Amino acid sequence: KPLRKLAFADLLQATNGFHNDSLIGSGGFGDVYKAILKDGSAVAIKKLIHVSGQGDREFMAEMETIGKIKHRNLVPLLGYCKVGDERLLVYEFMKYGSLEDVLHDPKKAGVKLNWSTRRKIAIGSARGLAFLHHNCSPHIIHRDMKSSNVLLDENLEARVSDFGMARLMSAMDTHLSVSTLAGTPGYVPPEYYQSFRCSTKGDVYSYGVVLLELLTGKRPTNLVGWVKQHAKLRISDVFDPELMKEDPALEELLQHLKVAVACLDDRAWRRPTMVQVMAMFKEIQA
Ligand SMILES: Nc1ncnc2c1ncn2[C@@H]1O[C@H](COP(=O)(O)OP(=O)(O)O)[C@@H](O)[C@H]1O
């Protein structure tokens, strides 16, 4: 399944002339439309914002990373469209949307995630980042891991998305020097404020915040310090009440909470690698 160059007229009519009825998201990153291609493919179409230089870097950032690799836990980039000042990217449609929308449900309605589901989402998210960190040469730093960049497919499996800020780092390097402090408040590693440098350890910190969301159910914007300050008190009160209402037996949660704590370490050298995170999830299964 190669990457398709899609004609602009196809995307024009598939979105009903970029009509608002199919628009499922705009602003911040780009306009996103739910569409059915003329072959019947159910897709998401990202109409890139600010193509003049800023969006063309994000365009190639995805083309260079998610457009060159395929993995069961990464959002599939199916196509692209380059026409003058118009950049478009086309993904396989994820049925249930982003993890953030499900945790903070619209008007408290939709799909509910039990712990058996959230654990599978945490494992799947971890496997996608480990693939970027370990299996990819050059390595890929997502630089913007968060709950809204975890997409849930038809089977509620996690697929990491939004590689618009991703950067390629050589395996011979420990860090990559950038020019802008990318990332979302609530997920930025504390050492990112110190230098214009990102790393895989930075993605691990941001993952730990996501694993906290699957455990606590709260918004990061904070959440990291609140769990650490309550970790010295009653750790039985930091988890999601719905997870405790299911069965007080899996309070397994602290074993995963140790993983989230280890990821959220202020020292990038003490954080585990995502390969270690996966092996820690494998030891809890046994
Ligand atoms: N491949 C996809 N499949 C299904 N829904 C998607 C896809 N990509 C984006 N969306 C939805 O469109 C909305 C806009 O996403 P986007 O602005 O790209 O979010 P982010 O900037 O956090 O990646 C999101 O709420 C997301 O749920």
Last residue of a domain, one of 33, 58, 93: 93
Pocket test for ligand 1, best of 41, 98, 103, 213 (most atoms within 8 A of CB): 98
- Beta strands 77-83 and 4-5, pairing class: parallel
Q: Is 2 helix (H, G, I), strand (E, B) or coil?
A: coil
| Ligand 1 centre distance from Cα of residue 170 (Å) | 29
DSSP one-letter code for 135 = I
Q: Is the preceding omega at residue 138 within 30 degrees of 0, hence cis? A: yes
Domain match, 175 and 258 both: yes
Q: How far apart are CA 265 and CA 259, in angstroms?
A: 10
Domain match, 126 and 87 both: no
Beta bridge partner(s), residue 81: 88
Residue 88: phi and psi, rounded to 5, are -130, 140
Contact 81, 11 (CB under 8 A): yes
| Ligand 1 centre distance from Cα of residue 245 (Å) | 31
Domain match, 150 and 259 both: yes
Q: How far apart are CA 269 and CA 136, in angstroms?
A: 21
Contact 46, 89 (CB under 8 A): yes
Q: Which of 226, 207, 224 is nearest to 272 (CA)?
A: 207
DSSP one-letter code for 5 = E
Last residue of a domain, one of 67, 93, 119: 93
Q: List C-alpha distances in Å: 14 to 38, 44, 124.
A: 7, 11, 31
Domain match, 111 and 38 both: no
Q: List binding-site positions for ATP.
A: 24-32, 46, 92-94, 98-101, 144-149, 162
Atom of ligand 1 nearest to the CA of 91: 1
Q: List binding-site positions.
A: 24-32, 46, 92-94, 98-101, 144-149, 162
Q: How far apart are CA 281 and CA 213, in angstroms?
A: 17
Pocket test for ligand 1, best of 46, 58, 91, 161 (most atoms within 8 A of CB): 161
Q: Two tokens at 258?
A: 């140790």
240 is catalytic: no
107-116 long-range contacts (CB < 8 A, ≥24 apart) are 111/156, 112/242, 113/156, 113/214, 114/243, 114/246, 115/243, 115/246, 115/250, 115/253
Q: How far apart are CA 123 and CA 278, in angstroms?
A: 7
Atom 12 of ligand 1: nearest residue by CA position: 25
The experimental resolution of this structure, in angstroms, equals: 2.5
Experimental method, per PDB record:
X-ray
Q: What is the number of domains present in the chain?
A: 2
Atom 21 of ligand 1: nearest residue by CA position: 29
- Beta strands 139-141 and 30-36, pairing class: unpaired
Contact 3, 89 (CB under 8 A): no
| Ligand 1 centre distance from Cα of residue 49 (Å) | 14
Q: How far apart are CA 34 and CA 95, in angstroms?
A: 10
Q: Which residues, judged by CB distance below 6 Å to any ligand atom, belong to the binding site of ligand 1?
A: 24-25, 28-29, 32, 44, 75, 91, 93-94, 97-98, 101, 148-149, 151, 161-162
Q: Which of 237, 72, 249 is nearest to 158 (CA)?
A: 72
| Ligand 1 centre distance from Cα of residue 158 (Å) | 13
Domain match, 107 and 65 both: no
Domain match, 35 and 148 both: no
Domain match, 114 and 155 both: yes
Contact 256, 119 (CB under 8 A): yes
Domain match, 257 and 185 both: yes
Please report which helix (H) or strand (E) contains residue 169, including its range.
strand 167-169
| Ligand 1 centre distance from Cα of residue 148 (Å) | 8
Pocket test for ligand 1, best of 20, 23, 26, 32 (most atoms within 8 A of CB): 32
Residue type, 51: V
Q: Is 17 helix (H, G, I), strand (E, B) or coil?
A: coil
Beta bridge partner(s), residue 177: 197
Which residue do the tokens 């960049």 mark?
A: 149
Domain match, 85 and 167 both: no
C-alpha dihedral (97, 100, 104, 108), degrees to nearest 10 = 10
**Pure H helices in 99-199:** 99-103, 115-130
Cβ burial, residue 23 (10 Å; 0-12/13-18/19+): middle
Catalytic-labelled residue, pool 144, 153, 203, 240: 144
Angle (deg, nearest 10), helices 253-263 and 200-216: 150
Residue 27: phi and psi, rounded to 5, are 75, 155
Q: How far apart are CA 200 and CA 272, in angstroms?
A: 10
**Could you list the residue range(s) of the whole structural domain that residue 17 is in?**
1-93
